[PDB]
Amino acid sequence: NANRSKEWKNAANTLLFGLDESVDPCEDFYGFTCNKFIERIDLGRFTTFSQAQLEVNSDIVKALEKVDVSQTERITKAAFQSCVEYREMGRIEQQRALPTFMYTWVNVDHKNVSRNSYYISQPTLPMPREFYVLPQFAPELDARTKAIENVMKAFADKMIKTAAREVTQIEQKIAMASWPDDELRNHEQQYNPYELFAPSRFGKYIAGLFIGDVIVTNPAYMGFLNTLFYPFVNYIIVHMLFEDADARMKCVDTITTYMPYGTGYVYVNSRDQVVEDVKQQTELIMKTFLKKSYRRAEKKINEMHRNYGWPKKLDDYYSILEAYNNKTDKTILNILRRGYENRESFRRKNETADRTNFLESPASVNAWYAPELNSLTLPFGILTSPHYDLQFPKAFNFAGSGTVGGHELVHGFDDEGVQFDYDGSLAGKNGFKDMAQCVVTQYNAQCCPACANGAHTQGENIADLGGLQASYNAYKEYIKMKGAEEMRLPGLEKFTPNQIFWISYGYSWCAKETQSSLVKRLLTNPHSPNSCRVNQVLQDIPSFAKDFQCALGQKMYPPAEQRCKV
Amino acid sequence: NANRSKEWKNAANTLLFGLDESVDPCEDFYGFTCNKFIERIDFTTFSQAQLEVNSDIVKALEKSQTERITKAAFQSCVEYTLKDDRKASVNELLQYISERFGGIPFLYREMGRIEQQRALPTFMYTWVNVDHKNVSRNSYYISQPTLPMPREFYVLPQFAPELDARTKAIENVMKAFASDILKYDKMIKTAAREVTQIEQKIAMASWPDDELRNHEQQYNPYELFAPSEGFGKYIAGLMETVFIGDVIVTNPAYMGFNYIIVHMLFEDAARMKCVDTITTYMPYGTGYVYVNSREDRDQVVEDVKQQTELIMKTFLKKMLSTLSWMQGESYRRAEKKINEMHRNYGWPKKLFGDDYYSILEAYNNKTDKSYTILNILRRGYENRESFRRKNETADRTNFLESPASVNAWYAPELNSLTLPHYDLQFPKAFNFAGSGTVGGHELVHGFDDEGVQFKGKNGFKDMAQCVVTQYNAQCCPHCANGAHTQGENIADLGGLQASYNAYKEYIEMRLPGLEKFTPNQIFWISYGYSWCAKETQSSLVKRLLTNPHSPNSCRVNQVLQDIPSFAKDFQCALGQKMYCKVW
Amino acid sequence: NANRSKEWKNAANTLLFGLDESVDPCEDFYGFTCNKFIERIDLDEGRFTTFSQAQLEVNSDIVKALEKFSQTERITKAAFQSCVEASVNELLQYISERFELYREMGRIEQQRALPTFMYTWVNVDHKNVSRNSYYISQPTLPMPRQFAPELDARTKAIENVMKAFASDILYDKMIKTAAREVTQIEQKIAMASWPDDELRNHEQQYNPYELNIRFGKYIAGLMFIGDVIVTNPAYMGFLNTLFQMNQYPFVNYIIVHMLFEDAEHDARMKCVDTITTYMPYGTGYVYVNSREDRDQVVEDVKQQTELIMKTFLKKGESYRRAEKKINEMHRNYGWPKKLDDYYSILEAYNNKTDTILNILRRGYENRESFRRKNETADRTNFLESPASVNAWYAPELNSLTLPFGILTSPHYDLQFPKAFNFAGSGTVGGHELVHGFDDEGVQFDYDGSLADCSKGKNGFKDMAQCVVTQYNAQCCPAHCANGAHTQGENIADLGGLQASYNAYKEYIKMKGAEEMRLPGLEKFTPNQIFWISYGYSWCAKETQSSLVKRLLTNPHSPNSCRVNQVLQDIPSFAKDFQCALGQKMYPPAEQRCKVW
């Protein structure tokens, strides 16, 4: 009874391409869903997101090339062309946006949503945080001296040898000082502000870049730095240097992360239907999620600062001025634009806190959410190929936008999201806490395929479970309004709508990765390892197991001990 | 089969008693060993065994001098109200003490000086032993203090709010304490959250277990002057004589910037327990007593010697076989680390033979019974030992605890193996199982993630990896945990196998009462016995998540499971929840 | 419990090599008994049966004893000692000596044991059992077989033989024709010869002829005769349509064939083996009179086999008739009764000396077994050496033998639990025993005459049919098997086992308990061990290609397919490993073909 609207045929090709019929649709759900997408592709990590992200970046190079007559654009253009080819630490941070010894950035204070308090957190290294220090892995330990001596002789003699083992050692001594992520899961503790007279050249340090109360997220690592203290300079060089080992991509990507505004304004304006199309989808989920104390979070949602698309402060006047602190003329640019990006975010400190800010370019794809202020952010880039394009079977746009929305939204109600109120502040909920153990335990009863653990990521794990499990209900409702959009996609007449919805959702996640980066990924992120993700989060949603009616016993349907919820 | 000497048939009795039989061993072996015992008796077969030698002690105690010292102290405690009359209102001097060390609710210095005082350290847990590097003199170790709660002060659910629990106990105490007025309330609750707070922090500072293994980096040789830029007073607190001593502080912790008090209290509430106190504090005294108790000592010496040397030989051979990753360099490395391994049995060589000498070394005690005062005395005393040998030469042999205590330990840096149901002359199952596996757990403990520290060897660390990831598959009720244990854990299924494999090459009659079980599978059983430990379910985490060791059920099933041989002695088709090579 | 006695350790050591307890024994079996063996033993630089294992063992022991008043034993010893090793010249001489084509062909066959175009050597007739009689029959040809180009491999090799010959000059292309000649000659021979399965109507292949057209005496070339019997009116006609130019391409063939024979002309085996093939009673006489031990073999079997038979036989008119048959069977154990020495020499009295050595043997074996013609017919002999490992049953004598050879490797040993031996020797023996009641043997009768031993023949075909179903639906791993051409000996073992098993059972019911768990794998009764054994014997892995190669050509099935089929057809075993129903080794569903 299928449909043959050509727009659906285009979206059909994508899903079908990765879908595999060889394997059954119950056992290793993830496997069946995208075994193809594994076995098709060439050779770091590579995955559906990286797929889209690519697509859109190609597109932006395109339009970039096309129109070359706002000065902002003009900048990004010339850039792209050019690319195709105590006090100490601070000063460097300023000029480089390369961090050491302290990571520093600014945003709304957590006590009150008015002054922009200074957050000084412990820094993130090129390699993972707690990968160094275990009676364990023997990785790369020289690669430092390796890459140093490389460019070293090009600069041109053996100080290198010691200097290496020394600097590495400074690292090792810095790492175990940090905090694992197991417990950057509590803001009750990081927040403990000090003034500008409490530091006892930190005054000078900042003077590299205030009278305001200053906040140290980590007082155990900050106090350890005082016991640490000349040769350290080497170290920083290392890192600074260490920054710098088709180029179409890596170029435009650098752009993305550094001219995080022009890119978006030059892509989204190269549009009134899209914003309105997702406007209802965002309002559909939220309320459905709601319908299930209660009053507070109820408010929170009803006050959450939604923001579709991209900033509204994107004629030209604003886009000009906001970035006007640029001047870039004819790859020293790399420096130039590194010193403008980090300064543009640090200059906001002086100004009063806002509720509309935009935490990153509207160019790439992940609906980032700041519990900090209170904000979803679904940058326009995302709402696209296979998450949602303007005319696909509602099956998708729910499984796409609707999803990553919901997965985001729910953050306001996880491990962290609880301890913030819509202001952006703090203060039977134990019941929920129970569930935590539940998931992380049941989850931990499952593994990865190459290790085989995941007790840190219950954050994003539950974020998924909820977001989707809700969203789906939302779609169910939506169609309960009408009852016909069930026109099943052409070129695949063996799944029902609901089936599809899942199939899509799965496909959203696939990836084929070298084992090395897999095991590193495992301990370097707030993520399940994707296969674990898909399979597990579907071990839980009942409605899924239903639509597939995979009878008992088959290894995806143990309702006996049921599936914890939120 | 089935001889009928006295102690023989009695051995048969013990193995027969707590056993269950209507539970198949190739299904649930955990409760099999002692199932009836769990439903009849109401804890371990150790506090059992411990109790036992303890009784034996008092049985010598009915009547030289060191004995007199003990017996008197024993009295001090066992004078019943000397456990009551003082703690009734000895707060009189608790004031003396406490206020001698500060104020109160509503008034770094003392920080450690409590050591010499009551050895209830806080904020500098410290002691001396061999300089880990330049092994000819001991020096110091000034490290983080173990916290009254286990590691878990976090948003970590398993404790996250249950922290409040402690508060209340604490809070409770205060009021019960605050009952006393010598020289209403609100403010306390604030004090609660302060103490708990500095707890969460001091933990945060500190170092959880799993990483506390790289002695490769736990070694920060510091001399007084980096401290002079963090103190020197503090150590001067621990003076009874000298500064050339080269301390080495392991754990860079956030030096600092009311609570210590909050702790001391928490330590200040028929007889055995007192003897236990002694055993942790007056090691060699009560020990020498134990020696004096039993003769036949020499024969035990003979035997347990032959036994232990036999086993360590076998283990060396195992090394010779397991050469799938290691090699010459590695091998004779091992060979060495073995044949340096020095050995103690029952007693050090300063205990007995001029039958007085201990009373010379232990000559740091007395009082007339003209207690809590004496308590403070004996506590401070144990410490008086733990340091005094700061001055003297590095001794490669030292019972770092009483012989009474019933365990085995490989003080690795001295490289010392040392030992105290105690092996009464039985069919070989017992004698070769109890002291066998003990020889085991020790002997392995000089080759795991610890041992390797006094190349391809990476492969080893992989072997470990394999064991670690096993357990968390199997555990008893929230599962058990992993990486915690690879130190104490993988010991067993190395050292056991080492041992067992002696038994055969040492070879023999079925037992009486029952005989159905031939020797070998018995050996298995009796080993299993040496852990039969009834426990509740709530203390189970308390001994799961806190300690380095790991609880029984794992430590029986997940032991066998990982040794084939136990295949070939139970009639079981290898394909069920029962039946990583380790060496 | 375990009879700690060493030899029992030795028996457990041979049962340990290939134990593979990792895989459940109730799931699959053949894995659980040989997978080790497949694994440890890398393929010796094809098929390496436990048999050929034995073969090495015995044949070695032979060699060991040889080296050392002594007549034939001396003959052999010399013969072998001439093995450590040009002489193509000799062959060339033979051909030259030849080059009335028939009589030529005759003498070639004769003094070179090379059969071509008429594979003939005599025995008793069937229809009149005292009268020796000749036979003439379709030859036996290298490939056994359509689809294949393996034909062209035969080609390549043929031309390459005559090439390597072309080394000697005492025309460098024409060979590349003579090749195709002899090939398509193969093709004719085959494409008229008879494929196998149809080789059972002994009713048919009997038509007699005495003194068709194109013939020359040709019997001369082998050395009032009886009626030469010709087993393929089809074939031995087809020569007649296939005959001064003829000589050129027809003799072309017999050469290349005869040549291809011996191209190649511790390895000592190779030649010793050959010797056993050709002077068989000789090397046999060695083996026994070099191992000499009778008690342990003149009885245990002659205890076993008697037990077995009696049991199986006893588990209308038929039952009796058949009984009288078995009761009648002449049953020759270890070895015959021509074995002090002289008379051994006396039959074997046709050799002496200081490829010539090989040529003296070839013609001596072609005459040896064919020299009985002049004498009276007998029921009392072997087919082959008492030094092989096999067991054969030429119903034409209703003779069941057991070459003493096998009885040492894992088919028999003296000091072993009655289990092992009731699964080794016991089996292959009971296998034999029945092997004369399937549709090969059943056509005969207590003398060797023919009316029909058997109507219940129905029930017989009822067995056969369903079994072929089961097989052609239980396909070996590496692509399937044949039917009938496999039932041929399948049905045999399928029965013989159940016989032997019952035998064990009743035996041990005749001697109390005795069940002494066996001392290296202590965790069984004997029974399980009995299975484990019969399983064992056939433990062999084979060349993946040669797997299918000998899949077709082997009369009887791949190892695995057997061992883990025959079992599936036994309720008893089904018990013995206290398994659950509705598993991979249970025909509640695909019902067992209860053969008896």
CA dist list (Å): C444 to C74, C122, C134, C378, C390: 41, 18, 19, 16, 22
Search chain C and give the residue with CA nearest B579.
C22
Beta partners for C400? C331, C393
> Partners for B (CB, 8 Å, 3+ pairs)?
A, C
Contact B254 A452 (CB under 8 A): no
DSSP C7-65: HHHHHHHHHHTT---SS-TTT-SHHHHHHHHHHHS--------HHHHHHHHHHHHHHHH
Taking any CB pair shorter than 8 Å as contact, residues of chain B touching chain C are 567-568, 570-575
> Which letter does DSSP use for residue A508 in this model?
T
Indicate yes or no: CB of B573 within 8 angstroms of CB of C21: yes
* Residue C385 token pair: 């050496």
Tokens of B21: 């039989």
Tokens standing for residue B40:
């009849």
From CA B291, how far away is CA A381, in angstroms rounded?
A: 81
Inter-chain CB proximity C523 and B574 less than 8 Å = no
- Measured in residues, chain A has a length of 566
Chains that touch C (3 or more CB pairs under 8 A): B
Which residues in chain B have their CB less than 8 angstroms from residue A186's CB? 154-155
B500 CA: distance to closest CA in chain A (Å): 30
B209 contacts B548 by C-beta, under 8 angstroms: yes
A220 vs B204: CB contact, 8 Å cut-off? yes
Nearest CA to B403 out of B290, B571, B572, B554 is that of B290
* Dist. CA C108–CA C116, nearest whole Å: 9
Helix (H, G, I), strand (E, B) or coil at A557: coil
One DSSP character per residue, C338-360 reads ----THHHHHT-S-----HHHHH
What would the DSSP string read from start to end of C96-117?
HHH--HHHHHHHHHHHH----S
Name the nearest CA neighbour of C322 among C434, C201, C489.
C434
Question: How many beta-carbon pairs below 8 A join chains A and B?
Answer: 65
Distance of alpha carbon B39 from alpha carbon B34, whole angstroms: 9
Interface probe, candidates C21, C532, C579, chain B, greatest B C-beta count within 10 A: C21
CB contact under 8 A, B255 and A227: yes
Angle between helices C484-508 and C300-314 (to 10 degrees): 110
CA A181/CA A456 separation, integer angstroms: 7
Q: What is the resolution of this structure in A?
A: 4.5
Contact criterion met (CB < 8 Å) for C523 and B575: no
**Residues of chain A contacting residue B214, judged by C-beta atoms under 8 Å apart:** 133, 135
Joined tokens for residue C538: 């056939």
CA A66, A69, A71, A76 dihedral sign is positive
- 8-state DSSP, B491: H
DSSP sequence for A460-485: HHHHHHHHHHHHHHHHHHHHHHHS-T
Instruction: State how far the Cα of A104 lies from the Cα of B164, in Å rounded to an integer.
Output: 33
How far lies A167's CA from each of A93, A160, A239, B249, in Å?
19, 10, 10, 22
Q: Would strands A118-121 and A214-216 be described as parallel, antiparallel, or unpaired?
A: parallel
Q: Are B444 and B494 in contact (CB under 8 A)?
A: yes
CB A426 within 8 A of CB A420: yes
Q: Which of B472, B485, B535, B545 is nearest to B158 (CA)?
A: B545
How many whole angstroms from its chain centre is CA C375? 27
Cβ <8 Å between A219 and B478 = no
Amino acid of residue C451: A
User: A136 near B461, Cβ under 8 Å?
Assistant: yes
- Cα dihedral value B375, B378, B380, B385, nearest 10: -170
As a dihedral over the C-alpha atoms of residue A487, residue A490, residue A496, residue A497, rounded to 10 degrees, the angle is -50
For the record, the structure tokens of C124 come out as 């008793």
How deeply is A503 buried, as exposed, middle or buried, from its count of CB atoms within 10 A (0-12, 13-18, 19+)? buried
For residues C168 and C95, give the distance between their C-alpha atoms in angstroms, rounded to a whole number.
14
H or E stretch at B140:
strand B138-143
Kindly report the number of other CB atoms within 10 A of residue A177's CB atom: 20
Rounded CA gap, C88 and B74, in Å?
A: 106
Nearest to C142 by CA among C558, C549, C551: C549
Report the Cα B543 to chain-centroid distance in Å: 13
Q: Which residue, chain included where needed, has tokens 């991209």?
A: A310
Identify residues of C whose CB sits under 8 angstroms from chain B CBs: 21-22, 24-25, 521-523
Q: What is the token pair recorded at A524? A: 């370097």
A183: which chain B residues are within 8 Å (Cβ-Cβ)? 154-156, 204
Structure tokens at B356: 């007085």
Residue A462, min C-alpha distance to chain B (Å): 15
Query: A220–B254: do the CB atoms touch at under 8 Å?
Result: yes
Set of chain B residues whose Cβ sits within 8 Å of the Cβ of C578: none
Report d(CA A73, CA A319) in Å as an integer: 10
B416 DSSP β-pair partners:
B342, B411
Candidates B400, B407, B451, B444; CA nearest to B213 is: B451
E strand residue ranges, C286-371: 330-334
Q: How far, in Å, CA of B342 to CA of B37, rounded?
A: 38
- Helices vs. strands in chain A: H and E counts, helices first: 25, 3
Instruction: Tell me if residue C547 falls in helix, strand or coil.
Output: helix
Give the whole-angstrom CA distance, residue B383 versus residue B401: 12
Is B254's CB within 8 Å of A185's CB? no
Shortest distance between the Cα of B25 and any Cα of chain C, in A, equals: 15
Contacts of B568 in chain C (CB under 8 A): 521-523
Interface residues on B facing A, Cβ-Cβ cutoff 8 A: 154-158, 160-161, 200-201, 204-205, 207, 210-211, 213-214, 217, 230, 252-256, 449, 458, 461, 469, 478-479
Other Cβ atoms less than 10 A from the Cβ of A174: the count is 20
Short-list A480, A506, A475, A419, CA closest to A289: A475
Cα gap C284→C404, rounded to integer Å? 9
Residues in B closer than 8 angstroms to C522, CB to CB, are: 568
In whole angstroms, how large is the CA radius of gyration of chain C? 25
Q: Of A281, A302, A279, A305, which Cα lies nearest the Cα of A290?
A: A302
User: CA A373, CA A360: separation in Å to the nearest integer?
Assistant: 14
Which one, of B320, B339, B343, lies nearest residue B330 by Cα?
Answer: B320
Alpha carbon distance C237, C38 (integer Å): 47
- What gap in Å lies between CA C538 and CA C544, rounded to an integer? 17
Query: CB–CB of B568 and C25 under 8 A?
Result: no
Neighbouring residues of A62: CB distance < 8 A, sequence distance ≥ 6: none
For residue A103, give the H/E element and its range.
strand A103-106
**What DSSP letter does each residue of B347-372 carry, written as one string?**
B-TTS---TTTHHHHT-S-------H
Token digits of residue B86: 């003082």
Q: Which amino acid is at C557?
A: S
Non-local CB neighbours of A273 within 8 Å, separated by 6+ positions? A390
Q: Which residue of B has its CA nearest to A223?
A: B254
Entry field: residues in chain C: 596
Chain A: closest CA distance from residue B213 (Å): 7
Instruction: Examine chains B and C and say if they touch (3+ CB pairs below 8 A).
Output: yes
Residues 6+ apart with CB under 8 A from B113: B101, B234, B237, B238
Chain C positions in Cβ-Cβ contact with residue B567 (cut-off 8 Å): 21
Question: Shortest Cα distance from A518 to chain B (angstroms)?
Answer: 17
Q: Measured between CB atoms, which of B156, B217, B255 is closest to A183?
A: B156
**Which candidate in B254, B469, B481, B489 is best for mutational testing of the A interface (most A CBs within 10 A)?**
B254
CA distance B542 to chain C (A): 38
Give burial (CB, 10 Å; 0-12/13-18/19+) of C132. Answer: middle
- Would the CB atoms of B252 and A224 count as touching at under 8 Å? yes
Chain B residues with CB under 8 Å of C12 CB are none
Q: Is B393 helix (H, G, I), strand (E, B) or coil?
A: strand
Annotated catalytic residues of A are: 408, 464
Task: State the Cα–Cα distance between residues C217 and C229, nearest whole angstrom.
Answer: 15
Contact between B575 and C522 using a beta-carbon 8 Å cutoff: no
Chain B residues touching A189 at Cβ < 8 A: 200, 204
A–C contact (≥3 CB pairs within 8 Å)? no
Rounded to the nearest angstrom, the minimum Cα separation between B266 and chain C is 56
Give the gap in angstroms from C-alpha B155 to the nearest C-alpha of chain A: 6
Cα–Cα distance measured from residue B583 to residue C400, given in angstroms and rounded to the nearest whole number: 54
Chain C: residue whose CA lies nearest to B518: C1
Distances in whole angstroms, Cα of residue B65 to Cα of each of A548, B57, B72, B278? 83, 16, 10, 16
Q: Which residues of B touch C2 (CB under 8 A)?
A: none
Chain C residues lying within 8 Å of B575, measured CB to CB: 24
Specify whether the CB–CB gap between A455 and A444 falls below 8 A: yes
Asked if B573 lies within 8 A of C25 by C-beta distance, the reply is yes
Q: How many CB atoms lie within 10 A of CB B402?
A: 22
Number of CB pairs < 8 Å for B and C? 13
CB-based contact A134 B211, cutoff 8 Å: yes
Half-sphere exposure of C221 (CA within 13 A, CB side): 21
CA distances from A185 to A182, A349, A423, B157, C520 (A): 7, 25, 20, 11, 58
In degrees rounded to 5, what are phi and psi of residue B140? -90, 170
Q: How is residue A401 written in tokens? A: 């936008």
Q: Are strands C132-133 and C123-124 parallel, antiparallel or unpaired?
A: antiparallel
